[PDB]
Design a protein around this nucleic acid. Structure first.
Length: 49
DNA sequence: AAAAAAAAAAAAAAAAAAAAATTTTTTTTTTTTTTTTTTTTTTT
């Protein structure tokens, strides 16, 4: 808990993802607009962290 | 000297020209939602 607070950028999660947030990133096509939406997990949401 | 022809000016009428002018509805598109199939994942 403290180390997450004290890093410049840091994210403290569980192995089992998080509440409405994964752990690894995922990317998925959107059939309507065809854009590959990129759900950001802890690993990428704290890149450089 | 009187008559008359011509001139300019003024007016009426018919043909052409001038001018004025937003609102309502429909359809594509995007975006989600729902059903049902397919796929994948957990159990004995």
């Amino acid at each position: 808990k403290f180390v997450e607070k004290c890093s410049p950028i840091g994210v403290y999660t569980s192995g089992k993802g998080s509440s409405a947030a994964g752990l690894t990133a995922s990317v998925m096509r959107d059939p309507s607009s065809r854009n590959f939406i990129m759900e950001g997990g802890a690993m990428v949401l704290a890149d450089g962290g």
